[PDB]
């Protein structure tokens, strides 16, 4: 008994979407969530829920929904699945192997790819240990290998952790930008706050 629409237009229709290592999080609560509205927007070529039954989802209440958003490449969308190796599922954004949520990834090469490359999306490349479930590495320190100390320079054995995606419109499907929004549903023992139309 809430009778209020959730602000899904703030995580699916935002001007500045997110970064890879600085993925945005907008927790939703105390509102009615009708996921069918997602079928009227741009064609979502990737809608793979993991334990959520995407079809007939309006008839399901949720306790705490966490909507995370970021932008990745094309061949790296398959790493947002719960449990996978690679480069962004180990040092940028990793999901637990209990993820009862939905990953919606849509191609954004129409507005997130400019001439000579869009360098406004950075992804982490060098990190000591693998990223733990739901950890955001907002820090950027010079990755000094544990052999010889380094300083604020760049050389043969000393480099920078973050890299720069080059989203050019002359790239085929796989290197084009893709906006990915993951909805994590708690569904634990607690009074629910987000339900559907019923």
């Amino acid at each position: 008994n809430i009778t209020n629409l959730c602000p899904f237009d703030e995580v699916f229709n935002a001007t500045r979407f997110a970064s890879v290592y600085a993925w945005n999080r907008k927790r939703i609560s105390n509102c009615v969530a009708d996921y069918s509205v997602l079928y009227n927007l741009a064609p979502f070529f990737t809608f793979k829920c993991y334990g959520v039954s995407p079809t007939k989802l309006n008839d399901l209440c949720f306790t705490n929904v966490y909507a995370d958003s970021f932008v990745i490449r094309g061949d790296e969308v398959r790493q947002i699945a719960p449990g996978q190796t690679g480069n962004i599922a180990d040092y940028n954004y990793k999901l637990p192997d209990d993820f009862t949520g939905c990953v919606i990834a849509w191609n954004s090469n129409k507005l997130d790819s400019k001439v000579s490359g869009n360098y406004n999306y950075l992804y982490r490349l060098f990190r000591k240990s693998n990223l733990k479930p739901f950890e955001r590495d907002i820090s950027t320190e010079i990755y000094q290998a544990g052999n010889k100390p380094c300083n604020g320079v760049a050389g043969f054995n000393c480099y920078f952790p973050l890299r720069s995606y080059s989203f050019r419109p002359t790239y085929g499907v796989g290197h084009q930008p893709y906006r990915v929004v993951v909805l994590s549903f708690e569904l634990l023992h607690a009074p629910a706050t987000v339900c559907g139309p019923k």
Epitope: T15, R16, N109, K110, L111, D112, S113, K114, V115, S116, N120, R168, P169, T170, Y171, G172, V173
Partner: antibody
């Protein structure tokens, strides 16, 4: 209702700097994916892209000309300014400013173009 | 760059095609390509953006195709008010190429 009107002096002395301005009305340049560029068209020749600006102050230029082309935005008054130095008697052409709505729609709406001549 | 046929003739009503070959293929996947029309004395007007798409205000007489790496503008049902210069433009790895020109001569 997109309207892109060019301005600036048509005649320019050789070896100087142009001040070709483009007033755009009917859209906001802050839209994600938008942008205003410039296309040169010599009399009796083909089109050639010169410069381009985006919604995040990103300035792209032609790889052949990067030491003279300078584009800037003045969204406070909706006026994109383009300045190029070292005007040679080969740049006499009809300059256009077209809006780049998105990456898929390359320069959909064009202006009217101004004939800039370089003669002593 | 992009090469186009210089002169193209067409009888009133028949269908013609304009080839946009990407010689020196640094164009990449060649995903986006837009065809503009320019009458003598006016500004280039976009006839058809990406090969399967049509802007509001253009009739179904214009269509686009791309067999393997060559864009083709199919114009069917020619009229007297169609003799204009057509330009195909795509994206390169570092610039925005605009190709050459193509003059349509509707005899009669």
């Amino acid at each position: 209702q997109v309207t892109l009107r060019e301005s600036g002096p048509t005649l320019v002395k050789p070896k100087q700097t142009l001040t070709l301005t483009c007033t755009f009305s009917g859209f906001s340049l802050s839209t994600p994916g938008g942008g205003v560029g410039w296309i040169r068209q010599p009399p009796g020749k083909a089109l050639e892209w010169l410069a381009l600006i985006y919604w995040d102050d990103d300035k792209r230029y032609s790889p052949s000309l990067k030491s003279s082309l300078t584009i800037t935005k003045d969204t406070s008054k909706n006026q994109v300014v383009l300045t190029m130095t070292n005007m040679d008697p080969v740049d006499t052409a009809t300059y256009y400013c077209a809006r780049l709505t998105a990456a898929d729609t390359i320069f959909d709406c064009w202006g009217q173009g101004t004939l800039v001549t370089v003669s002593s | 760059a992009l090469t186009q046929p210089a002169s193209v003739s067409g009888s009133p009503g028949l269908s013609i095609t304009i080839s946009c070959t990407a010689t020196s293929s640094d164009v990449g996947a060649y995903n986006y390509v837009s065809w503009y029309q320019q009458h003598p004395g006016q500004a280039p007007k976009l006839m058809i953006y990406d090969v399967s798409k049509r802007p509001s205000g253009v009739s179904n007489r214009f269509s686009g195709s791309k067999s393997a790496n060559t864009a083709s503008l199919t114009i069917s049902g020619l009229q007297a008010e169609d003799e204009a210069d057509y330009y195909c433009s795509s994206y390169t790895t570092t610039s925005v190429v605009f190709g050459g020109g193509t003059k349509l001569t509707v005899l009669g």
